[PDB]
Amino acid sequence: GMNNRELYGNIRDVYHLLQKNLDKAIEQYDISYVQFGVIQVLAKSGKVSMSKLIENMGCVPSNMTTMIQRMKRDGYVMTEKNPNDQRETLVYLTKKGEETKKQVDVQYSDFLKENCGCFTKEEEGILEDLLLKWKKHLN
């Protein structure tokens, strides 16, 4: 009902304020949350496939191939055809992108503190329980 609808709305609003505030925080590095996400994904995993990257993206945009090409010319990522399967593209961080991650992690750390630090320790425990209960229900 209106209680369920009000809850869906509150969770989206908080999520959207968090992306807005993260984008503000990483602004200086000429990247947005979407490019930042790719850099985080590609640092953890090694040289993965385009498909693996799309799968590992928590949220996939409506222009991945275009968006990666932009990152390719910018010098953050490098793409190459897999010598085994010619219809597959492997993607990985360049030295510059590796260095860009290091520099952005400092602003990201500050982002999490300044934006996810408003609750008391008691409230954090309550919020954690409730959000994990919600995950189990949805998957």
Add this chain to the structure above:
Amino acid sequence: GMNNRELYGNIRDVYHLLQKNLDKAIEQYDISYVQFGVIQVLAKSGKVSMSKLIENMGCVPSNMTTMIQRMKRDGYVMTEKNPNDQRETLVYLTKKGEETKKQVDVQYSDFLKENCGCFTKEEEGILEDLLLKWKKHLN
């Protein structure tokens, strides 16, 4: 720290499971959350501008103009140049899109119940308080 980072992660994960589950729910109507969003925005407001629509989108995709053209050929929305300002495009729902909203609202109502109804009434009140506290902090 790790508490702040774990909280950011939990809120994103729940949000992403909600879009996944909504897309599954509205699948039959040949639309995704992004097209559904536009239909909801355009039903509430009347004939708005492309800019107004982009602003009123809680989350704006990386291909609005392309994505609206797709909805234009599909017959959900209609676009026209404003006779006052020629460099401005006005957008609005067609009869089909108006009818599509009616039919999707039934599945959306079921989506909210099946996905945002897992908490007790006591928990709903606690979750509401915590999420509103988070909004005030972020804006």
